[PDB]
Structures are given as C-alpha cells and as structure tokens.
Coordinates of C-alpha atoms in Angstrom, one line a residue:
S74 CA 0.0 0.0 0.0
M75 CA 3.1 2.2 0.4
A76 CA 4.5 0.1 -2.4
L77 CA 5.0 1.8 -5.8
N78 CA 3.3 0.8 -9.1
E79 CA 5.5 -0.4 -11.9
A80 CA 4.6 2.9 -13.5
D81 CA 5.2 4.8 -10.3
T82 CA 8.7 3.3 -9.8
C83 CA 9.7 4.1 -13.4
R84 CA 8.6 7.7 -12.7
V85 CA 10.3 8.0 -9.3
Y86 CA 13.4 5.8 -9.9
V87 CA 14.0 4.4 -13.3
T88 CA 13.5 7.4 -15.6
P89 CA 15.4 9.7 -13.3
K90 CA 18.4 7.3 -13.1
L91 CA 18.4 6.9 -16.9
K92 CA 18.5 10.7 -17.3
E93 CA 21.2 11.0 -14.6
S94 CA 23.3 8.7 -16.8
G95 CA 22.9 10.9 -19.8
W96 CA 20.5 9.0 -22.0
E97 CA 18.4 12.1 -22.8
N98 CA 21.4 14.3 -23.9
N99 CA 21.5 14.5 -27.7
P100 CA 22.1 12.6 -29.8
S101 CA 21.1 9.8 -27.4
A102 CA 17.5 9.2 -26.4
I103 CA 15.1 7.2 -24.3
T104 CA 11.9 5.8 -25.7
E105 CA 9.6 4.4 -23.1
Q106 CA 7.1 1.7 -24.1
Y107 CA 8.9 1.0 -27.4
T108 CA 6.3 -0.8 -29.6
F109 CA 8.0 -2.4 -32.5
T110 CA 5.5 -5.1 -33.7
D111 CA 2.0 -5.0 -35.2
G112 CA 0.4 -7.9 -33.5
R113 CA 0.1 -11.4 -34.8
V114 CA -3.0 -11.9 -36.9
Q115 CA -5.1 -14.4 -34.8
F116 CA -8.4 -16.1 -34.8
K117 CA -11.1 -16.4 -32.2
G118 CA -14.3 -18.4 -32.8
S119 CA -15.2 -17.7 -36.4
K120 CA -13.7 -14.2 -36.2
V121 CA -10.2 -12.7 -36.8
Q122 CA -8.0 -10.1 -35.0
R123 CA -4.5 -9.1 -34.0
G124 CA -3.4 -10.0 -30.5
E125 CA 0.3 -9.5 -29.6
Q126 CA 2.0 -6.1 -30.2
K127 CA 5.5 -6.4 -28.7
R128 CA 6.7 -3.6 -26.5
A129 CA 9.8 -3.0 -24.3
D130 CA 9.6 -0.8 -21.2
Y131 CA 12.6 1.3 -22.4
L132 CA 14.8 1.4 -25.4
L133 CA 18.1 3.2 -25.0
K134 CA 19.3 4.8 -28.2
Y135 CA 22.9 5.9 -28.5
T136 CA 21.9 7.8 -31.6
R137 CA 18.5 8.4 -33.2
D138 CA 19.2 5.8 -35.8
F139 CA 21.3 3.6 -33.4
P140 CA 19.6 1.7 -30.6
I141 CA 22.0 0.1 -28.1
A142 CA 20.2 -1.3 -25.0
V143 CA 16.9 -2.3 -23.5
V144 CA 15.4 -2.2 -20.0
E145 CA 12.7 -4.3 -18.2
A146 CA 11.2 -2.4 -15.3
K147 CA 9.3 -4.0 -12.4
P148 CA 7.6 -2.6 -9.3
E149 CA 10.0 -1.6 -6.5
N150 CA 8.7 -4.3 -4.2
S151 CA 9.7 -7.1 -6.6
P152 CA 13.2 -8.8 -7.0
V153 CA 15.5 -7.6 -9.8
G154 CA 16.5 -10.9 -11.2
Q155 CA 12.9 -11.4 -12.2
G156 CA 12.9 -9.3 -15.4
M157 CA 16.3 -10.6 -16.5
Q158 CA 15.3 -13.3 -18.9
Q159 CA 12.6 -11.1 -20.3
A160 CA 15.0 -8.3 -20.9
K161 CA 17.5 -10.7 -22.5
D162 CA 14.8 -11.9 -24.8
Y163 CA 14.1 -8.4 -26.1
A164 CA 17.8 -7.7 -26.5
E165 CA 18.1 -10.9 -28.6
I166 CA 15.0 -10.0 -30.7
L167 CA 16.1 -6.3 -31.2
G168 CA 19.7 -7.3 -31.9
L169 CA 21.1 -5.5 -28.8
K170 CA 24.2 -6.3 -26.8
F171 CA 23.1 -4.8 -23.4
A172 CA 20.1 -5.8 -21.3
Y173 CA 18.9 -4.4 -18.0
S174 CA 16.4 -5.5 -15.4
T175 CA 15.5 -3.0 -12.7
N176 CA 13.1 -2.5 -9.8
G177 CA 14.0 1.2 -9.3
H178 CA 16.5 0.8 -6.5
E179 CA 18.4 -2.1 -8.0
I180 CA 19.9 -2.6 -11.5
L181 CA 20.8 -5.9 -13.0
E182 CA 22.9 -6.0 -16.2
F183 CA 23.5 -8.8 -18.7
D184 CA 26.3 -7.8 -21.1
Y185 CA 26.5 -9.9 -24.2
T186 CA 30.0 -8.7 -24.9
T187 CA 31.3 -10.3 -21.8
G188 CA 28.6 -12.8 -20.8
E189 CA 28.7 -11.4 -17.3
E190 CA 25.5 -10.7 -15.3
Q191 CA 25.8 -8.3 -12.4
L192 CA 24.2 -5.6 -10.3
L193 CA 25.3 -2.0 -11.0
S194 CA 25.3 1.1 -8.8
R195 CA 23.8 2.9 -11.8
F196 CA 23.1 2.7 -15.5
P197 CA 26.0 2.9 -17.9
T198 CA 26.2 6.1 -20.0
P199 CA 25.6 6.1 -23.7
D200 CA 29.4 6.7 -24.2
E201 CA 30.4 3.8 -22.0
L202 CA 28.1 1.3 -23.8
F203 CA 29.1 2.5 -27.3
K204 CA 32.8 2.2 -26.3
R205 CA 32.0 -1.4 -25.1
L206 CA 30.1 -2.1 -28.3
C207 CA 32.9 -0.9 -30.7
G208 CA 35.6 -2.6 -28.6
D209 CA 34.0 -6.1 -28.9
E210 CA 33.0 -5.6 -32.5
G211 CA 36.4 -4.1 -33.5
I212 CA 35.6 -0.9 -35.2
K213 CA 38.4 1.7 -35.6
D214 CA 37.9 5.3 -34.7
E215 CA 38.1 6.3 -38.4
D216 CA 35.0 4.2 -39.0
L217 CA 32.8 5.5 -36.3
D218 CA 31.1 8.1 -38.5
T219 CA 30.1 5.5 -41.0
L220 CA 28.8 3.2 -38.3
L221 CA 26.6 6.1 -37.1
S222 CA 25.9 7.6 -40.6
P223 CA 22.1 8.6 -40.5
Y224 CA 19.4 6.6 -42.3
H225 CA 17.5 8.5 -44.9
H226 CA 14.1 9.3 -43.2
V227 CA 10.4 10.1 -43.7
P228 CA 12.6 1.1 -41.1
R229 CA 11.2 -1.6 -38.9
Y230 CA 13.3 -3.1 -36.0
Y231 CA 14.5 -6.2 -38.1
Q232 CA 15.5 -4.1 -41.1
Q233 CA 17.6 -2.0 -38.8
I234 CA 19.3 -5.2 -37.4
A235 CA 20.0 -6.2 -41.0
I236 CA 21.3 -2.8 -42.0
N237 CA 23.6 -2.3 -39.0
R238 CA 25.1 -5.8 -39.1
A239 CA 25.9 -5.3 -42.8
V240 CA 27.5 -1.9 -42.3
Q241 CA 29.3 -3.4 -39.3
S242 CA 30.5 -6.4 -41.3
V243 CA 31.9 -4.2 -44.0
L244 CA 33.7 -2.0 -41.5
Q245 CA 35.3 -5.2 -40.0
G246 CA 36.6 -6.2 -43.4
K247 CA 34.3 -9.1 -44.2
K248 CA 34.3 -9.1 -48.0
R249 CA 31.4 -11.5 -48.3
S250 CA 28.2 -11.4 -46.2
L251 CA 24.7 -13.0 -46.4
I252 CA 21.3 -11.8 -45.2
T253 CA 18.2 -14.1 -45.2
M254 CA 14.8 -12.4 -45.2
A255 CA 11.4 -13.9 -46.0
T256 CA 9.9 -12.5 -49.2
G257 CA 7.9 -9.4 -48.6
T258 CA 9.8 -8.1 -45.6
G259 CA 11.8 -5.2 -47.1
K260 CA 15.0 -6.5 -48.6
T261 CA 15.1 -3.3 -50.8
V262 CA 14.6 -1.0 -47.8
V263 CA 17.7 -2.7 -46.3
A264 CA 19.6 -2.6 -49.6
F265 CA 18.9 1.1 -49.9
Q266 CA 19.9 2.2 -46.3
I267 CA 23.2 0.2 -46.3
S268 CA 24.1 2.1 -49.5
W269 CA 23.0 5.4 -48.2
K270 CA 24.8 5.0 -44.9
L271 CA 28.1 4.1 -46.5
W272 CA 27.7 6.5 -49.4
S273 CA 26.9 9.7 -47.6
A274 CA 29.6 8.8 -45.1
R275 CA 32.2 8.8 -47.9
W276 CA 33.2 5.2 -47.0
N277 CA 35.2 3.1 -49.5
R278 CA 37.7 0.3 -50.0
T279 CA 40.8 2.5 -50.2
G280 CA 39.9 5.0 -47.5
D281 CA 40.3 8.3 -49.1
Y282 CA 37.6 10.9 -49.4
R283 CA 35.9 9.7 -52.6
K284 CA 32.3 8.5 -52.6
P285 CA 32.0 4.7 -52.9
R286 CA 30.9 3.0 -56.1
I287 CA 28.0 0.6 -55.6
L288 CA 26.3 -2.0 -57.9
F289 CA 22.9 -3.3 -57.2
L290 CA 22.0 -6.5 -59.1
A291 CA 18.5 -8.1 -59.3
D292 CA 16.3 -9.3 -62.1
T293 CA 13.0 4.0 -53.5
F294 CA 16.4 5.2 -54.6
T295 CA 15.4 8.6 -55.8
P296 CA 17.4 10.2 -52.9
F297 CA 20.5 9.2 -54.9
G298 CA 19.6 10.8 -58.2
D299 CA 22.2 11.5 -60.8
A300 CA 24.6 9.4 -58.8
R301 CA 22.3 6.8 -60.1
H302 CA 22.8 4.9 -63.4
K303 CA 21.1 1.9 -64.9
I304 CA 23.3 -0.2 -67.2
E305 CA 21.2 -0.6 -70.4
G306 CA 21.7 -1.2 -74.1
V307 CA 28.8 1.5 -70.3
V308 CA 29.2 4.6 -68.2
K309 CA 32.2 5.0 -65.8
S310 CA 31.3 8.4 -64.3
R311 CA 28.3 7.6 -62.0
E312 CA 28.3 6.3 -58.4
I313 CA 25.2 4.1 -57.8
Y314 CA 24.6 1.4 -60.4
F315 CA 21.7 -0.9 -61.1
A316 CA 21.7 -3.9 -63.5
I317 CA 19.6 -6.9 -64.4
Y318 CA 21.6 -10.1 -65.3
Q319 CA 20.2 -10.0 -68.9
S320 CA 21.8 -6.5 -69.3
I321 CA 25.2 -7.4 -67.6
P322 CA 27.6 -9.8 -73.8
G323 CA 29.7 -9.7 -70.6
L324 CA 29.5 -5.9 -70.6
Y325 CA 30.9 -5.5 -67.1
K326 CA 34.5 -6.2 -68.3
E327 CA 34.4 -2.7 -69.6
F328 CA 34.6 -1.7 -66.0
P329 CA 37.8 -2.6 -64.2
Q330 CA 37.9 -5.3 -61.4
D331 CA 38.4 -2.7 -58.7
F332 CA 35.8 -0.3 -60.0
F333 CA 33.1 -0.9 -57.3
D334 CA 33.6 -0.7 -53.5
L335 CA 30.4 -2.6 -52.9
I336 CA 28.0 -4.9 -54.7
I337 CA 24.6 -5.9 -53.4
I338 CA 22.7 -8.9 -54.8
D339 CA 18.9 -8.9 -54.7
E340 CA 18.7 -12.8 -54.6
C341 CA 21.7 -15.1 -54.4
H342 CA 19.9 -18.3 -55.4
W343 CA 26.6 -14.6 -62.4
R344 CA 29.3 -16.0 -60.1
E345 CA 31.6 -14.8 -62.9
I346 CA 30.6 -11.2 -62.3
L347 CA 31.2 -11.7 -58.6
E348 CA 34.4 -13.6 -59.0
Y349 CA 35.4 -11.0 -61.6
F350 CA 34.6 -8.2 -59.2
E351 CA 36.7 -9.2 -56.3
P352 CA 37.9 -7.4 -54.1
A353 CA 34.7 -5.4 -54.1
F354 CA 32.8 -6.0 -50.8
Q355 CA 29.8 -8.2 -51.5
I356 CA 26.5 -8.5 -49.7
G357 CA 24.2 -11.2 -50.7
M358 CA 20.5 -11.4 -49.8
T359 CA 18.3 -14.5 -50.1
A360 CA 14.7 -15.3 -49.2
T361 CA 15.2 -18.9 -48.3
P362 CA 17.3 -20.4 -45.4
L363 CA 20.0 -23.0 -45.8
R364 CA 18.3 -26.2 -47.0
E365 CA 19.0 -28.9 -49.6
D366 CA 18.9 -27.0 -52.9
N367 CA 20.5 -24.0 -51.2
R368 CA 24.1 -25.0 -50.0
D369 CA 26.3 -23.3 -52.7
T370 CA 24.9 -20.0 -51.7
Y371 CA 25.7 -20.4 -48.0
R372 CA 29.1 -21.8 -49.0
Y373 CA 30.0 -18.8 -51.2
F374 CA 28.7 -16.0 -48.9
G375 CA 29.0 -18.0 -45.6
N376 CA 26.5 -18.1 -42.8
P377 CA 23.9 -15.3 -42.6
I378 CA 24.6 -12.2 -40.4
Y379 CA 20.9 -12.1 -39.8
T380 CA 17.8 -14.1 -40.5
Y381 CA 14.2 -12.8 -40.5
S382 CA 11.9 -15.8 -41.1
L383 CA 8.3 -16.2 -42.3
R384 CA 7.7 -17.5 -38.8
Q385 CA 8.9 -14.3 -37.2
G386 CA 7.2 -12.1 -39.7
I387 CA 3.8 -13.8 -39.0
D388 CA 4.4 -13.5 -35.3
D389 CA 5.2 -9.8 -35.6
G390 CA 2.1 -9.1 -37.7
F391 CA 4.1 -8.2 -40.7
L392 CA 3.4 -11.2 -42.9
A393 CA 0.2 -13.1 -43.3
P394 CA -0.8 -16.4 -41.7
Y395 CA -2.2 -19.3 -43.8
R396 CA -4.5 -22.3 -43.9
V397 CA -3.5 -25.5 -45.7
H398 CA -6.1 -27.6 -47.6
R399 CA -4.4 -30.7 -48.9
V400 CA -6.5 -32.4 -51.5
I401 CA -5.7 -36.0 -52.5
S402 CA -7.2 -38.0 -55.3
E403 CA -9.2 -41.1 -54.2
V404 CA -7.1 -43.6 -56.2
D405 CA -4.5 -43.0 -53.6
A406 CA -5.9 -43.8 -50.2
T407 CA 6.5 -43.4 -56.0
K408 CA 7.7 -41.7 -59.2
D409 CA 8.2 -38.2 -60.8
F410 CA 7.4 -38.2 -64.5
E411 CA 4.1 -40.0 -63.8
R412 CA 3.5 -37.3 -61.2
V413 CA 3.0 -34.7 -63.9
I414 CA 1.0 -37.2 -66.0
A415 CA -1.6 -37.6 -63.2
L416 CA -1.6 -33.8 -62.6
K417 CA -2.4 -33.0 -66.2
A418 CA -4.9 -35.8 -66.5
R419 CA -6.9 -34.4 -63.5
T420 CA -7.1 -30.8 -64.6
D421 CA -10.9 -30.9 -64.6
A422 CA -11.2 -32.4 -61.2
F423 CA -9.0 -29.7 -59.7
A424 CA -10.9 -27.0 -61.5
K425 CA -14.2 -28.4 -60.3
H426 CA -13.0 -28.6 -56.7
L427 CA -11.4 -25.1 -56.8
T428 CA -14.6 -23.6 -58.2
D429 CA -16.9 -25.3 -55.5
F430 CA -14.4 -24.1 -52.9
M431 CA -14.5 -20.5 -54.1
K432 CA -18.3 -20.7 -54.5
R433 CA -18.6 -21.6 -50.8
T434 CA -16.0 -18.9 -49.7
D435 CA -15.5 -15.9 -52.0
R436 CA -15.8 -16.0 -55.8
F437 CA -13.8 -12.8 -56.2
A438 CA -10.9 -13.7 -53.9
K439 CA -7.8 -13.2 -56.1
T440 CA -6.2 -16.6 -56.8
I441 CA -3.1 -17.9 -58.5
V442 CA -2.8 -21.4 -59.8
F443 CA 0.6 -22.9 -60.4
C444 CA 0.4 -25.5 -63.2
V445 CA 2.9 -28.0 -64.7
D446 CA 3.7 -26.1 -68.0
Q447 CA 2.2 -23.4 -70.1
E448 CA 0.0 -25.9 -71.9
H449 CA -1.4 -27.0 -68.5
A450 CA -2.0 -23.4 -67.5
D451 CA -4.1 -22.8 -70.7
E452 CA -6.2 -25.9 -70.2
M453 CA -6.7 -24.9 -66.5
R454 CA -7.7 -21.4 -67.5
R455 CA -10.3 -22.7 -70.1
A456 CA -11.8 -25.2 -67.7
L457 CA -12.0 -22.8 -64.8
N458 CA -13.6 -20.2 -67.2
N459 CA -16.3 -22.5 -68.4
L460 CA -17.0 -23.7 -64.8
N461 CA -17.6 -20.0 -63.9
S462 CA -19.2 -18.9 -67.2
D463 CA -21.8 -17.1 -65.3
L464 CA -19.1 -14.7 -64.2
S465 CA -17.2 -15.0 -67.5
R466 CA -20.2 -13.5 -69.2
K467 CA -20.0 -10.5 -66.9
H468 CA -16.2 -10.3 -66.6
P469 CA -14.4 -11.7 -69.8
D470 CA -11.1 -11.7 -67.9
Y471 CA -12.3 -13.6 -64.8
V472 CA -9.6 -16.2 -65.4
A473 CA -6.4 -15.3 -67.3
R474 CA -3.2 -17.1 -68.1
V475 CA 0.1 -15.3 -67.4
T476 CA 2.9 -17.2 -69.2
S477 CA 5.8 -16.4 -71.5
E478 CA 3.7 -17.4 -74.5
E479 CA 1.0 -14.8 -73.6
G480 CA 3.5 -11.9 -73.9
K481 CA 2.3 -8.3 -73.7
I482 CA -1.3 -9.5 -73.3
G483 CA -0.2 -11.6 -70.4
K484 CA 1.5 -8.6 -68.8
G485 CA -1.7 -6.6 -69.1
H486 CA -3.6 -9.2 -67.1
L487 CA -0.9 -9.5 -64.4
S488 CA -0.8 -5.8 -64.1
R489 CA -4.5 -5.4 -63.3
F490 CA -4.5 -8.5 -61.1
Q491 CA -1.8 -6.9 -58.9
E492 CA -3.9 -3.7 -58.4
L493 CA -5.6 -3.5 -55.0
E494 CA -8.7 -1.7 -56.4
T495 CA -9.5 -4.0 -59.4
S496 CA -11.9 -6.9 -59.1
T497 CA -10.6 -9.0 -62.1
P498 CA -8.8 -11.1 -63.2
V499 CA -9.7 -13.1 -60.2
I500 CA -7.7 -16.2 -61.2
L501 CA -4.3 -16.2 -62.9
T502 CA -2.8 -19.5 -64.1
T503 CA 0.9 -19.8 -64.8
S504 CA 3.6 -22.4 -64.5
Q505 CA 7.0 -20.8 -63.7
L506 CA 6.9 -17.1 -64.4
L507 CA 4.8 -16.0 -61.4
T508 CA 6.9 -18.0 -58.8
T509 CA 8.8 -14.7 -58.4
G510 CA 6.8 -12.8 -61.0
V511 CA 3.8 -11.6 -59.0
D512 CA 3.5 -8.8 -56.4
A513 CA -0.1 -8.9 -55.5
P514 CA -0.9 -8.2 -51.8
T515 CA -4.7 -9.0 -52.0
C516 CA -3.9 -12.5 -53.3
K517 CA -6.0 -14.7 -51.0
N518 CA -5.6 -18.2 -52.6
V519 CA -2.4 -19.9 -53.6
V520 CA -3.0 -23.0 -55.6
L521 CA -0.6 -26.0 -56.3
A522 CA -1.2 -28.0 -59.4
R523 CA 2.4 -28.8 -60.2
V524 CA 5.5 -30.8 -59.3
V525 CA 7.6 -28.5 -57.1
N526 CA 11.1 -29.6 -57.5
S527 CA 12.9 -27.5 -54.9
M528 CA 12.5 -25.9 -51.5
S529 CA 13.4 -22.4 -52.9
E530 CA 10.6 -22.7 -55.4
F531 CA 8.1 -23.9 -52.8
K532 CA 8.8 -20.9 -50.6
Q533 CA 8.5 -18.5 -53.5
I534 CA 5.1 -20.0 -54.4
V535 CA 3.9 -19.7 -50.8
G536 CA 5.3 -16.2 -50.6
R537 CA 2.8 -15.1 -53.2
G538 CA 0.2 -14.8 -50.5
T539 CA 2.1 -13.8 -47.3
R540 CA 1.8 -10.0 -48.0
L541 CA -0.6 -8.1 -45.7
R542 CA -3.3 -5.6 -46.7
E543 CA -5.7 -5.2 -43.8
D544 CA -6.5 -2.1 -45.7
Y545 CA -8.2 -4.2 -48.4
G546 CA -9.5 -7.1 -46.2
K547 CA -6.3 -9.0 -46.7
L548 CA -5.2 -10.6 -43.4
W549 CA -4.5 -14.3 -44.1
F550 CA -4.5 -16.7 -47.1
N551 CA -5.2 -20.3 -48.2
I552 CA -2.9 -22.8 -49.8
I553 CA -4.9 -25.4 -51.7
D554 CA -2.6 -28.3 -52.5
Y555 CA -3.7 -30.7 -55.3
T556 CA -0.3 -32.4 -55.6
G557 CA -1.1 -34.4 -52.5
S558 CA 2.4 -34.0 -51.1
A559 CA 4.1 -30.7 -51.8
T560 CA 3.0 -29.2 -48.5
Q561 CA 4.1 -32.3 -46.6
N562 CA 7.3 -32.7 -48.5
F563 CA 8.5 -29.1 -48.1
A564 CA 7.1 -28.6 -44.5
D565 CA 9.4 -26.3 -42.7
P566 CA 8.3 -25.2 -39.2
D567 CA 11.6 -23.6 -38.3
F568 CA 11.4 -21.0 -41.0
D569 CA 7.6 -21.0 -41.6
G570 CA 6.1 -22.0 -38.3
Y571 CA 3.0 -24.2 -38.4
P572 CA -0.2 -23.2 -40.2
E573 CA -3.2 -22.0 -38.3
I574 CA -5.4 -24.8 -39.9
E575 CA -4.3 -27.8 -41.9
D576 CA -6.7 -30.4 -43.2
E577 CA -6.8 -32.9 -46.0
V578 CA -9.7 -34.1 -48.1
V579 CA -10.1 -37.0 -50.5
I580 CA -11.6 -36.3 -53.9
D581 CA -13.0 -38.5 -56.7
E582 CA -12.2 -38.4 -60.4
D583 CA -14.8 -35.6 -60.9
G584 CA -13.4 -33.4 -58.2
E585 CA -16.3 -34.1 -55.7
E586 CA -15.1 -34.9 -52.2
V587 CA -15.7 -38.4 -50.8
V588 CA -16.0 -39.7 -47.3

C-alpha cells in the first residue's frame, strides 16, 4: 500500500536514473514503451483479430538511428533478477548487446559482450556502452562516422538489425556477407539504407575521401539521383549502379575489377561477375534459409549475419498467416514423371474442386494457380472459365493465363491483377513465371497443381500470399494443395512456423469430395 506501481517506480526511480546517466542528452534518447511489432493476426471463434503487439519498457538509443540497450522495469517491491530473462529476450530480438532489469533501487545487467551478469550502482552512460560495443566488434575510430551515418528518413526493427550488421560487417573487413529475409519483408529497404549509410559517409575500400561505387543487381532510390545509373543497351562516371543479369555480352568487363567498392545482390539463389569483381565488398540477400537445394549460396557467402523468417514475420504481424487444404485423389488412399501425368490428367477435377471451394467462400478472392507447364495453364484457364461462365459472361477476364507465351497481353492481365482496387482477373494460371513474377498483396488463394522440384521454389510460391493488406481485407490466405504431397514434402516449421489450420480431403475423379 506504500508500495509503488511499476509505473510509479519508473517515474520515481527508473527514468530519473536513466537521465542522470545521460540517455536524454542529444544525440542519445530514451523511448519508453517502445512498440515495434504490429500484432500477430489471430483467430477467435469464427472471427479474426491481431493480439500480440511487442513492447519494451525502455529502449536506449545511442543515436536516433542507433539503438543500443533495453530495460525491463518492475515494481520496487519485486526482486530484480525477475525481469532478466525477459530483458535478455528483447535484447536478442532487437539485436542489442546490453540488457537491464530494474526495480527502481536495483539494476541488473547482462552484457552480451562479456557474458557477465551483475548488479550495478547505476546505469552505464551512452558513451560507456558504445565504447564497449565498438571494442567487442572491433571498429576503428576512423569508421565511427560510417557506423553512425544517419538513415534516410520520412525502417522496422528487423530491417535495422540487418542494415547495421551489414555496415558493421563491411567495417570489419568481411568481403562476403549473407542476409536471409522472408519475401515481402523489405530487402530493398535494407539494400537502400546500407548504400545510403556508406555512401553519404564517404566510405570506401581504399579509405580516401571519394564516394563509394555501388552496384545493385537483381532481375525508393530517388534520394541518390544523378549518382544513379542503370546499365542498359557503359558509363564509368556515375556512383550508384543498377543492373539486371540480362543486361550485364559480358558488358561488365568494360569496368575494371576494382571499380566498385560494394555490390549488393537482390537474390543469391553470375558467379563470374562476382568472382570478376573481387575485391569489391559483396552483400548477398536471399529469401530462403540453408536447405537442400541452397548450399552453394551459403558456401560462397557464408552463414547469414541475420535471418528474418516467415515465422517471425507472421508472429510480428508483418506477414500473413495461412491455412493448408491438402487435396488428394481417391485412387491414392512413387515416381516423378508420372507425377505430372496424373496432374495434367486431373485438370478438370481440380478445376471443379477449386470452383466449388470458391463458391462456398469468395468467388472474387484473387487466386493464382501454379500448373505443370504453359500448356497446362491454358487448359486450366479454359476449364475454370467454363466452370464460372456465369461470371465470365460479366467479366471476360475472370480467369487469365500469365505465361511467357502470352507476352504483352499476359503482362496486361498480371498488371491489373496486382492492383488493390480492381476486381478482375480473379484467377491467374501460370507455370513458372509467377513464382517470383507476382507482387499482388490482395492475393487470397495460392493453388498448387504442379510438381515443385525445390525448397526455394516452394517458398517462392507460398510467398505469393504472405503479404498483408488489412486495408483491403487481406489478413491471411489459403494454400490449396492438389499435388497431395508438396505441403508435406516441403514442410518447414523452423522457417515457416505451423499453419493455423491444416486439413486434408479425398476427392474422386470428378473433383467431388468423398467420405
């Protein structure tokens, strides 16, 4: 009754002690109740909502764009060692090296740089921690201004982890680093801020005053303008270059080996450009973790400096959760070339089953169906069209095929499909092109009607629907599996977590379920 609230002890003891230690003297700052998550999309009864919303009592920032420690406060009447594991957990999630648990009068510190846990007579100062941070990480005084080089503002907690560890890696002389981030989490935001940090800071391989030369390769940057140059159709006067593999025969040899100071790759899973461009620092980004088809990537770039999984994204409310509906044909209640035989021979069963499914759920939910080949995609499109001819007669482009064969007409359909405000096409059929070809956030159904031959491909397919758009009613999605194995074969709880719902249904040769 004389005892102080958790809130009361932060006001009376914690905050004052933090200020006394200089955490409010510019550029350092204190941000109480640091909320850095959006809340896991959950379900309750037949209804959906976000629960979660991760928050730390205090976040201690050395600089505005440079967080460095975290604090777990508790009421004065409770023991300090209580909030230690909770504080350590936030440190680990936010990528920090210093964690504190306090009850107002006592302060318990866990220092990741020494592994020592101890009571302090007071909070360390911004300078003390940053000196500890640079010492353990080995960053010379000359590189302090690059390490603290400001972001370009007006990035989420994990993007910052990625960005800082990359910049840190480069400053330590690691000429080859890897970053794994689930598709749709901001790999480009990270790519851009690393470039900006090092560029504006005048960082480079030789260490003079020149701006660095950076090549971004793939297959937001306006702030750079005129330093910018796309390699099309050569120019050795710009500073920030972009290039698609198709454009870079062997053009790059016109640039010398030591032209670039840094090269950033959109997706690592060509080696001649990289092995040609040594000793340029190289940062590789990939969307899939080390698995069976993936090894050479992790061998060339080494182990990731940071990994942001699908599992973490869903838990943070940044990626969408999913339901799996495995559909197996009755005849089965091992091969590979017969696999595709059966798949193409059942095109009408799948189309009937998908149509009934959509009729009982949402006939206008944007859907993508991954077929065996372009020929399969066209037959799938025609079948699905005729099964929904009541809608076809109102919307001629209800179903559409997006394949290489469909050229410019194909691109048109894809373009409209991707738009948030358009109602059709509703269904796009493809084979390979849309595995990494589509960026459609309102996609609500991801359909498998093909032999997936790799883990990377599987995750790319599944990543077609993980994007969130609460804005447009997009909170979760379905993965309808007609292969009767893909979702079991490529199951990956470590990177993907488990699905909210997962069921299997048996279907006859006409696509009617049986029991």
